[PDB]
Ligand SMILES: *[C@@H]1O[C@H](CO)[C@@H](O[C@@H]2O[C@H](CO)[C@@H](O[C@@H]3O[C@H](CO[C@H]4O[C@H](CO)[C@@H](O)[C@H](O[C@H]5O[C@H](CO)[C@@H](O)[C@H](O)[C@@H]5O)[C@@H]4O)[C@@H](O)[C@H](O[C@H]4O[C@H](CO)[C@@H](O)[C@H](O)[C@@H]4O[C@H]4O[C@H](CO)[C@@H](O)[C@H](O)[C@@H]4O)[C@@H]3O)[C@H](O)[C@H]2NC(C)=O)[C@H](O)[C@H]1NC(C)=O
Ligand SMILES: *[C@@H]1O[C@H](CO)[C@@H](O[C@@H]2O[C@H](CO)[C@@H](O[C@@H]3O[C@H](CO[C@H]4O[C@H](CO)[C@@H](O)[C@H](O)[C@@H]4O)[C@@H](O)[C@H](O[C@H]4O[C@H](CO)[C@@H](O)[C@H](O)[C@@H]4O)[C@@H]3O)[C@H](O)[C@H]2NC(C)=O)[C@H](O)[C@H]1NC(C)=O
Ligand SMILES: *[C@@H]1O[C@H](CO)[C@@H](O[C@@H]2O[C@H](CO)[C@@H](O[C@@H]3O[C@H](CO)[C@@H](O)[C@H](O)[C@@H]3O)[C@H](O)[C@H]2NC(C)=O)[C@H](O)[C@H]1NC(C)=O
Ligand SMILES: CC(=O)[C@H]1CC[C@H]2[C@@H]3CC[C@H]4C[C@H](O)CC[C@]4(C)[C@H]3CC[C@]12C
Ligand SMILES: Cc1ccc(-c2nc3ccc(C)cn3c2CC(=O)N(C)C)cc1
Ligand SMILES: *[C@@H]1O[C@H](CO)[C@@H](O)[C@H](O)[C@H]1NC(C)=O
Ligand SMILES: CCCCCCCCCCCC
Ligand SMILES: CCCCCCCCCCCC
Ligand SMILES: CCCCCCCC
């Protein structure tokens with residue numbers, strides 16, 4: 001859960 | 017260097033002998049130095065092997081110049 | 093077809109990352125080899141090349157199928173789809189499989205679960221040659237291999253009945269040595285990651301000295317005879333005697349240098365080094381014999397050949 | 411066959427939802443990566459190239475809470491290819507010229 005935030009940040013970055 | 021000294025026991029009136037012996041000895045010293053240095057990299061300073069080879073070269077060259085000195089004292 | 097469905101069923105729900113019987117029992121692997129050729133033995137670099145057809149078989153309950161088809165004979169395509177043991181060679185400086193035209197791999201799957209997996213390899217194995225006596229050195233060059241990560245409790249190796257299917261030795265690139273035989277061992281080595289079963293093949297190689305005789309020994313004996321002939325030359329010929337002696341000893345130094353160049357950089361005197369040293373003694377002694385003569389000849393004319401022959405007998409018999 | 415299925419489920423659960431990009435404890439304290447070396451050979455120390463060739467079993471261990479399992483009482487040694495799916499330290503040797 002602690003690392004999930006940065007995972008979502010990276011996924012949002014690479015999206016589109 | 018040891019066989020360079022046998023020139024000293026040879027007769028003084030043997031220029032063709034002592035000169036040839038000293039020349040062969042000094043040229044072989046040069047060849048050995050160059051062969052050793054070729055294996056090593058192009059290193060710009062004297063190493064311990066370099067300084068020992070140079071000392072022995074000075075010794076054999078001194079023996080050759082010793083015969084030269086004897087010849088110039090007798091004939092010249 | 094009837095075979096494609098079998099492969100699809102086999103690979104369906106197949107975890108490639110898990111070894112067979114993980115957490116149940118160690119996976120027994122039977123390894124066999126066909127030594128196609130023992131390549132050049134690089135005594136200078138303490139390594140030798142060997143080309144092998146390395147085969148390993150094991151049972152995988154996941155890869156079992158019942159049908160009229162008895163075996164699934166497949167190319168390298170299916171090698172990466174199923175679990176293959178991580179067999180590495182412990183003493184290989186550099187090894188590479190063959191890929192031309194396609195990867196040189198074979199894979200056969202029986203009904204019971206046998207998975208015969210073979211591939212062609214060119215291993216530059218590391219043989220720790222001990223050339224204390226050269227060029228008469230005899231070496232038992234090993235070839236170890238074990239699982240890299242699976243301990244003794246997870247991957248066990250074993251030798252099949254056929255020890256090693258060594259090929260015909262006529263075509264081998266082994267010029268220096270002669271292949272005497274092969275011997276296998278299986279021992280449990282302990283290391284930091286665990287206990288690993290290691291299987292080693294020792295190939296016994298015996299050196300041949302014919303090239304070294306015509307290369308080093310014969311020239312040194314001939315130059316020693318050149319040192320000998322100085323005695324028969326008249327003593328009054330000072331330049332002739334001195335020239336012969338100096339040419340002999342200096343070319344002896346050059347021959348010693350090249351002969352040592354043939355050897356690696358090791359700090360111990362070898363048999364060839366002993367022979368060249370004795371030749372040094374002989375040529376230098378002849379030069380000193382004329383040096384003391386100018387400042388006896390018949391005694392040298394006998395002693396030098398007899399001493400050389402006696403030393404030759406003593407040296408060669410050893 | 412129970413152990414095989416349980417291990418497959420455990421490994422699949424571990425690898426599922428795993429981000430290789432983020433290091434362990436990302437946005438937190440540094441991860442302690444212990445290192446162990448077992449030198450197997452020093453092939454040649456050449457002065458011409460001013461270099462030495464060294465062969466070793468370079469081992470490193472670190473704690474990753476994402477890869478923690480407790481259902482099975484044993485240590486899972488996996489295929490080497492799983493290293494391509496797990497975060498590993500970006501260790502490098504500043505001296506190496508060809509490795
Ligand atoms: C640092 O960078 C270097 C490169 O700068 C990386 O090295 C490269 O790594 C890649 C990926 O691991 C290698 O690609 C693989 O090559 C396989 C065959 O390689 C042979 O040919 C190449 C030339 O193309 C040679 O350079 C190789 O020789 C060198 O490598 C070997 C070790 O592999 C050494 O031992 C040698 O001494 C050389 O150093 C080889 O001769 C190729 O088969 C493979 O492709 C298969 O696997 C992939 C996996 O995804 C599949 O997608 C693909 O379809 C193939 O799968 C088929 O074939 C296999 C064969 O068994 C079957 O099992 C499958 O089922 C399927 O049928 C892959 O392409 C590359 O060779 C290598 N070297 C280079 C580029 O020079 C380092 O990895 C990298 N990291 C580190 C830590 O160093
Ligand atoms: C999965 O992998 C882990 C780690 O690799 C294994 O855990 C190791 O199990 C072995 C089995 O015995 C342990 O070995 C011994 O453990 C004893 C317990 O000491 C604990 O407590 C002290 C307290 O300070 C800790 O320092 C220590 O690390 C342990 O946590 C030790 O007392 C032993 O010490 C000496 O034992 C023999 C005696 O002859 C010596 O030869 C040894 O060299 C050593 O000096 C010994 O260490 C080991 O400690 C465990 N390590 C860890 C990290 O847990 C699991 O067993 C493995 N799972 C499997 C195999 O299923
Ligand atoms: C290569 O390795 C294999 C396996 O380690 C060696 O074969 C094994 O040799 C031993 C001793 O010769 C065999 O044990 C003996 O078997 C005979 C016949 O059954 C029996 O009468 C004896 O009492 C003893 O048990 C062993 O069976 C055999 N392995 C197999 C699978 O048959 C082989 O010798 C090695 N090659 C070498 C060293 O060159
Ligand atoms: C009188 C005498 O003893 C003679 C004997 C041998 C002579 C030397 C030979 C090498 C010469 C090289 C160059 O020609 C410079 C002078 C040089 C060093 C000479 C100096 C005088 C010497 C010592
Ligand atoms: C233990 C073992 C035995 C034989 C093989 C093997 N499989 C093949 C397939 C094809 C070709 C050409 C050669 N193969 C060879 C090697 C061989 O038998 N030679 C060279 C006579 C592999 C492992
Ligand atoms: C394969 O089928 C045969 C006959 O249907 C059966 O006897 C055998 O047990 C089967 N093997 C399996 C399911 O592994
Ligand atoms: C720069 C170092 C000098 C190298 C030559 C050394 C020669 C000294 C020995 C002479 C003995 C007579
Ligand atoms: C002078 C003759 C030199 C060669 C002698 C060889 C003797 C045979 C040795 C064979 C090994 C025992
Ligand atoms: C740099 C020291 C040289 C010493 C030369 C000795 C006499 C030729």
Ligand SMILES: CCCCCCCC
Nearest residue numbers: 081085086088089092
């Ligand atoms: C060493 C060279 C100078 C002295 C030579 C002998 C007297 C002329």
Ligand SMILES: CCCCCCCC
Nearest residue numbers: 305309310313401404
């Ligand atoms: C093979 C080198 C030695 C040959 C014997 C010579 C004896 C005079």
Ligand SMILES: CCCCCCCC
Nearest residue numbers: 320321324390393397
């Ligand atoms: C090489 C052998 C011939 C010399 C012997 C005869 C001289 C007395």
Ligand SMILES: CCCCCCCC
Nearest residue numbers: 018021022025383384
């Ligand atoms: C120091 C080299 C040998 C000298 C011998 C000369 C004759 C007694």
Ligand SMILES: CCCCCCCC
Nearest residue numbers: 390391393394397398
């Ligand atoms: C006077 C000595 C004669 C030498 C006989 C041959 C020795 C090889």
